[PDB]
């Protein structure tokens, strides 16, 4: 059966070519070596905050499933209104 769970091979999930392609899409020609760790840390902090907000919303809604509507509500409460996914 499934006798395993998730580990810390998760910060390393944000691979280096992915961050490089994101910087190239933004407009960066040369990317330093110590940028990947800081980017992963900032992304982890942001995801932690958004997931905490979504968990609070789900606990207030008396539910156990996080929905895209709750995610959009949390993102708008922070100050980032997202369109398309939801309504």
């Amino acid at each position: 059966k499934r006798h395993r769970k998730v580990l810390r091979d998760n910060i390393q999930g944000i691979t280096k070519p992915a961050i490089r392609r994101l910087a190239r899409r933004g407009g960066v020609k040369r990317i330093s070596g110590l940028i990947y760790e800081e980017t992963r840390g900032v992304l982890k902090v942001f995801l932690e905050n958004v997931i905490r907000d979504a968990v609070t919303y789900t606990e207030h809604a008396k539910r156990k499933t996080v929905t895209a509507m709750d995610v959009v509500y949390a993102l708008k409460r922070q100050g980032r209104t997202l369109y398309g996914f939801g309504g």
Partner: protein, 100 residues
Amino acid sequence: KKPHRYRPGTVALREIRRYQKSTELLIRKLPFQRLVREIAQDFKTDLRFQSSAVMALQEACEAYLVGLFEDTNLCAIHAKRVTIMPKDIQLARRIRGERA
């Protein structure tokens, strides 16, 4: 333009032009799906994430990363430079008012 060696700095411009005309996701879903589940474990266990929540999360994260990279690139050329550095991301985040 021999296929053995290309001038460094020229292939990056073509890559930038090619990647700036597409709307596909750069971060992959399966590595990003486990990061969302691993963070939600500290708050409350036995949680079921919808198929549309991870997509919006990835889209928002990609947009935020693109904005931060653009801000860092704008801060890089200020000091007569062309490359980004970790000492620039801190200032770019502090001026925006996120780190406080």
